[PDB]
């Protein structure tokens, strides 16, 4: 019958436009939005009818309920709010036109309404129409009970029409992005745009998207990060830069992952990772406080039917050292940080991993074993925002070596709800060391790991003109959005998420 | 010789590393910016030395000049400004350190400086160092002198270091984008993000980029516009939306074109192209006045060597109807607008094009002949911002039919300096007619060339739930940036422009 409904309504509207009654008018002049209509006339007492005030409003009909005969009620929704249209035959321009327009309208139709403010005896704020105009028809039968995720994601307009909390979620996302922009702008950062199509992909670890250019006979890669360009701009003499933009990583699609996602990266000259830690603290805490009204946010990792945790964004965030506290959590002593590239150390980590029953699928390397181990014993203890610091050099090819600690780097990751929302480090400004680490990555690429970084000679050349001491920073926007919208699925914070056929 | 310089300096810095003097230190604490230093201490009289005040500043050396025994002057630049470092061994930590650090430093090096505010006998504001620290060396010899555009564009960091106006250009760009954001946000628009990877490309006429998605095992297209998603979100009940983002169109590279470029598209419910014309007037004029100080801005189309024109952004912008004023410019009456799709009128326009010596390379079709004639007789007429309005339906498949004019649409393009910075129209909300036009041009794609748009079934399906009367708008950000930065090349307003060697 929904199919038949579609057929019938299609035909009706069709002969409507055949008869020249214009079911799709060009322009309707709206005097006031529904929201401040509500704000303005909410003070009215039940039974009130203001005959000398005429207003034009517009919206979508979410319900149509007849009292029969001379009276009919329309549920008019828009802007996430509600207004009742009480259409009384005697209050209409004429009975005939009242009848005619009422027989035409259906649930889901976009209509304009010209009428008087008022309030029903039931106490409902309403508008009493002089004339109702159909702005555009809905040819499909609108759902009754959309509680299923996939249908919601594939058609987002239905989800937005029927579900307000969706609108609220994307509002929250927008608020986040704008807040970050304000925060960085007022700190003297320059909002920049860097190429999203590169000769050689870099700045991160992931499988790239490949495309062809119809001018240059060459192939091109979609960017997995903005890092190198930003650092090159810092080399250029622009001391503070930031970009909130789309980043492409071709990989699995899951609750925390989407092939294309929005990230924010900023680079700050003369800053180190400590500075960025405090700046991160106040940015995140201030964001959470401004948006949610508090430092503490309730979040459901398993969904509304599961247990909820309270996340406390009150600064300062807890700081943890990776290797150190990994030794604490393992109850074992790890090799000194200078020895980590040794196959002996790799064997030690292997035996520790198998002793703790921590699975590490092939290829089995010091870095993968360490990552899975940290993921098991450390990341799980992060509910409140938590800094995991001082990563080994092997896990951080672009990070500057730790000043006091042999074999480590100056780097931190910010974890909320066991997930990583931030990655930042003191930038490596030494061109020789950078090119060497790139050499190791290149050799490891030609044999081992294929998502391993490719040597960028332009970037090293840029480093040869010199890079002031600088700290870089980056944040997944979508994940932060998830946590501030109370979403366990990234598809919730994406308007049109990638979906499988 | 510069090569020899690179080798020598590289060897020297490497040996600084071997000797453990740390040419790339981790952290230097900057007390005050160069700008703040300059404006705070500019009140000093020549000869002043403040021994009570000690500050730390940092920057890049653009010059090194020695009195040569005990006295060395450094020209220290950063933040688009300059500060002199006057180093005499008497005021240094000790003479020995003075000698050492001065023998270490070269032009182009990033240095920190700890010292006192002062002013030279010549009256130049300076800082007199207690100690100078090398933050990072420059291994290359800097141009004395970087005029060649190719070199400027390929290495942007060099251009930013040596040329001060570049920074101002990109600052102006950022100001433009931020201004547009403030404008639309304040008008109650929601800033949104829509997929940059589409199954079916649409929203404009362009040759697309093609890429492959691994997990989904299918090809996807890079977006040529955000239009359809936005309109679908308007369907969803979000009345006002906007996106400033990257758009990919795979085509020729020239002064006005880049394969990837930034566009801003917004969509406004219950508005038509008139409203958007007024809004465009206010936005553009307000932008130009806010950024440049006035409504009038000087622009060189052929460059500094050529003539400059005065562009007057004072509202209202001049309006011209395409067909009417084309008739008036040709001195010929064209066919009635309802006849524009017949072969006859096309033949007429062929005759007019050959009579006016207006060249139209094959295929010669009505649309392209119209485009060439309008381009020749009309687009050149626009120096000040000018609205070209009421395009024929054949040139506007996505535009709603003109209410008072049959064969035309409600649409306008905004032209500044003969170039098109804006495209906007009253959105076509009729699903049947839309699918019809789509199917005509799909029938053209089947008629044997690829220019014409692909049919989006999901978009029409979305239109079947109905689209409120809506107007929509888009703007090239890069071109606007060009005109406000006085640039005749788009590569000037792009940080790392696409290059063809």
């Amino acid at each position: 019958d929904p199919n038949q409904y579609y057929k019938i309504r299609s035909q009706a509207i069709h002969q409507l436009k055949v008869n020249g009654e214009d079911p799709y008018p060009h322009k309707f002049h709206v005097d006031i939005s529904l929201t401040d209509f509500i704000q303005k006339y909410s003070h009215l007492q039940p039974g009130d009818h203001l005959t000398d005030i005429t207003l034009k409003v517009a919206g979508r009909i979410h319900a149509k309920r007849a009292s029969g005969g001379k009276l009919i009620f329309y549920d008019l929704r828009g802007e996430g709010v509600k207004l009742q249209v009480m259409a009384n035959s005697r209050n209409y321009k004429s009975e005939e036109e009242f009848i005619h327009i009422n027989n035409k309208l259906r649930r889901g139709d976009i209509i304009g309404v010209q009428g008087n403010p008022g309030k029903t005896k039931k106490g409902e704020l309403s508008i009493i129409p002089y004339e109702i105009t159909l702005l555009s028809p809905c040819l499909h039968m609108l759902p009754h009970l959309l509680k299923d995720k996939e249908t919601r994601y594939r058609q987002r307009y239905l989800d937005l029409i029927l579900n307000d909390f969706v609108r609220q979620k994307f509002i929250i996302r927008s608020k986040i992005i704008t807040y970050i922009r304000s925060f960085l702008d007022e700190l003297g950062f320059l909002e920049i745009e860097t190429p999203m199509m590169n000769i050689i992909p870099g700045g991160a670890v992931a499988k790239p998207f490949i495309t062809y250019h119809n001018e240059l006979d060459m192939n091109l890669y979609m960017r997995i990060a903005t890092e190198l360009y930003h650092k090159m701009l810092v080399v250029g003499g622009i001391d503070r830069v930031y970009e909130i933009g789309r980043v492409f990583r071709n990989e699995g699609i899951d609750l925390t992952h989407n092939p294309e996602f929005t990230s924010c990266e900023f680079y700050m000259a003369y800053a180190d990772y400590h500075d960025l830690m405090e700046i991160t603290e106040k940015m995140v805490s201030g964001m959470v406080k401004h948006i949610t009204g508090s430092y503490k946010v309730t979040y459901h990792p398993d969904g509304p039917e599961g247990q909820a945790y309270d996340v406390d964004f009150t600064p300062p965030f807890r700081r943890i050292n990776m290797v150190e506290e990994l030794e604490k959590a393992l109850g074992m002593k790890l090799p000194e940080t200078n020895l980590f590239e040794t196959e002996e150390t790799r064997k030690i980590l292997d035996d520790i991993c198998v002793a703790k029953a921590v699975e590490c699928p092939p290829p089995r390397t010091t870095a993968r074993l360490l990552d899975k181990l940290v993921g098991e014993f450390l990341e799980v203890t992060c509910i409140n925002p938590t800094f995991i610091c001082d990563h080994p050099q092997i896990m951080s090819p672009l990070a500057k070596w730790h000043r006091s600690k042999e074999g480590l780097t100056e780097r931190f990751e910010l974890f909320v709800m066991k997930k990583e929302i931030c990655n930042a480090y003191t930038e490596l400004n030494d061109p020789m060391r950078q090119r060497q680490l790139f050499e190791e990555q290149a050799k490891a690429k030609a044999a081992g790991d294929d998502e391993a970084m490719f040597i960028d000679e332009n970037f090293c050349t840029a480093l040869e003109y010199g890079l002031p001491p600088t700290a870089g920073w980056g944040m997944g926007i979508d994940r932060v959005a998830m946590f501030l919208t109370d979403s366990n699925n990234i598809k919730e914070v994406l308007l049109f998420p990638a979906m499988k056929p | 010789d510069p090569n020899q310089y690179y080798k020598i300096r590289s060897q020297a810095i490497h040996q600084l590393k071997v000797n453990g003097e740390d040419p790339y230190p981790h952290k230097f604490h900057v007390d005050i910016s160069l700008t703040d230093f300059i404006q705070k201490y500019s009140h000093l009289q020549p000869g002043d030395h403040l021994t009570d005040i000690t500050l730390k500043v940092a920057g890049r050396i653009h010059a090194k000049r020695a009195s040569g025994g005990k006295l060395i002057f450094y020209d220290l630049r950063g933040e688009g400004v300059k500060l002199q470092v006057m180093a005499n061994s008497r005021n240094y930590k000790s003479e020995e350190e003075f000698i050492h650090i001065n023998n270490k430093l070269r032009r182009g090096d990033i240095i920190g400086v700890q010292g006192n505010p002062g002013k030279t006998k010549k009256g130049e504001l300076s800082i007199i160092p207690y100690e100078i620290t090398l933050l990072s060396p420059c291994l290359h010899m800097l141009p004395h002198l970087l005029k060649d555009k190719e070199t400027r564009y390929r290495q942007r960091y060099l251009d930013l270091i040596l040329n001060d106006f570049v920074r101002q250009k990109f600052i102006i760009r950022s100001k433009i984008i931020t201004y547009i954001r403030s404008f639309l946000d304040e008008l109650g628009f929601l800033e949104i993000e829509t997929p940059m990877m589409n199954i079916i490309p649409g929203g404009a006429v362009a040759k697309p980029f093609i890429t492959y998605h691994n997990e989904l095992d299918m090809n996807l297209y890079m977006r040529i516009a955000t239009e359809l998603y936005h309109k679908m979100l308007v369907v969803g009940g979000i009345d006002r939306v906007y996106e400033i983002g990257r758009v990919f169109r795979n085509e020729g590279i020239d002064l006005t074109h880049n394969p990837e470029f930034t566009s801003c598209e917004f969509y406004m419910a219950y508005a038509d192209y008139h409203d958007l014309m007024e809004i465009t007037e206010k936005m553009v004029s307000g932008m130009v006045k806010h950024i440049t100080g006035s409504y009038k801005v000087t622009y060189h189309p052929d460059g500094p060597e050529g003539q400059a024109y005065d562009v007057d952004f004072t509202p209202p912008f001049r309006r011209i109807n395409m067909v009417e004023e084309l008739e008036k410019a040709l001195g010929m009456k064209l066919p009635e607008t309802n006849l524009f799709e017949t072969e006859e009128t096309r033949k007429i326009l062929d005759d007019i094009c050959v009579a006016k010596a207006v060249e139209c390379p094959p295929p010669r079709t009505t649309a392209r002949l119209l485009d060439k004639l309008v381009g020749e007789f009309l687009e050149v007429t626009c120096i000040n911002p000018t609205f070209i309005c009421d395009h024929p339906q054949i040139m506007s498949p996505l535009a709603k039919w003109h209410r008072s004019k049959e064969g035309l649409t409600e649409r306008f393009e905004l032209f500044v300096m003969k170039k098109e910075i804006c495209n906007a129209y009253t959105e076509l909300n009729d699903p049947m007619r839309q699918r019809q036009l789509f199917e005509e041009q799909a029938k053209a794609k089947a008629a044997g060339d690829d220019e014409a748009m692909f049919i989006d079934e999901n978009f029409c399906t979305a239109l079947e739930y109905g689209l409120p009367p809506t107007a929509g708008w888009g703007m090239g950000i890069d071109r606007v940036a060009m005109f406000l930065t006085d640039s005749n090349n788009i590569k000037e307003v792009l940080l790392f422009p696409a290059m063809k060697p």
Binding site: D185, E186, L187, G188, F189, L190, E191, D239, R240, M268, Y270, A271, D275, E278, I279 | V30, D31, I32, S33, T35, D36, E79, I171, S174, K175, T178
Partner: peptide
């Protein structure tokens, strides 16, 4: 806390 730089806007 990092040193202060005037906003570009």
């Amino acid at each position: 806390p990092m040193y202060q730089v005037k906003p570009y806007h």
